[PDB]
Ligand binder design. Sequence first.
Ligand code: ZYB
Ligand code: ZYB
Lengths: 115, 115
Amino acid sequence: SMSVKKPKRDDSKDLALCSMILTEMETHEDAWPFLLPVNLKLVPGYKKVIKKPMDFSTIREKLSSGQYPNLETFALDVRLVFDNCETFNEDDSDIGRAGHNMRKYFEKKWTDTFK
Amino acid sequence: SMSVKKPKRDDSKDLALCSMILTEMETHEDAWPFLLPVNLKLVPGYKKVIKKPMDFSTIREKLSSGQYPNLETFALDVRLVFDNCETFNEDDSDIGRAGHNMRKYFEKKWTDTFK
Ligand SMILES: N/C(=N/O)c1ccc(F)cc1
Ligand SMILES: N/C(=N/O)c1ccc(F)cc1
């Protein structure tokens, strides 16, 4: 609270580390469903169903332009990518499996980097 | 944003300084309408009209128990006291004038202490 602070965590490397993790996500062989935004004019249902579209290239543009105020908000967008994927894809499909794989991939990198 | 911070303002004295200012408010001769919470069972209209009652003793209890996370939230409660006063009192009344006087009194102390 006021004048009562926890010891300051050094966050000076967070931006670089998030960029690193995002690069690993981007280069994963199962990243292809998530690299670019879904074309809302070509994919039936997506615009009405998915209230907050997100993809790696958008995350990258936000990261590169200071639109994440902290670690937590970066992770939220990354997880949003896979939450959307689950909403729109059967688990038993190529894209469904990709999402599950990439989520697991992210969460371990996330833990190994900060936890 | 992430890994981009303004120079750290030293906030270690804010709690003591807010307490000091609150003490000056409390001891002002026109503090009497604001020292204690309005009795909602004895004052017609107040409970239905004033959605967020606030008074100095409540501010003091919050301050003393770490319920203000920062300067801004302390000032918000103080100003709420006088906003409520304006809502429920004619400017041309003793309590109305008290509120205006105490608000001016606060805002100068506030500026002189932090600005
Ligand atoms: N099930 C799909 N197969 O291509 C699919 C196509 C486009 C999408 F945006 C999501 C899923
Ligand atoms: N006008 C008033 N006179 O006592 C007044 C009384 C009680 C209040 F809570 C506010 C105002």
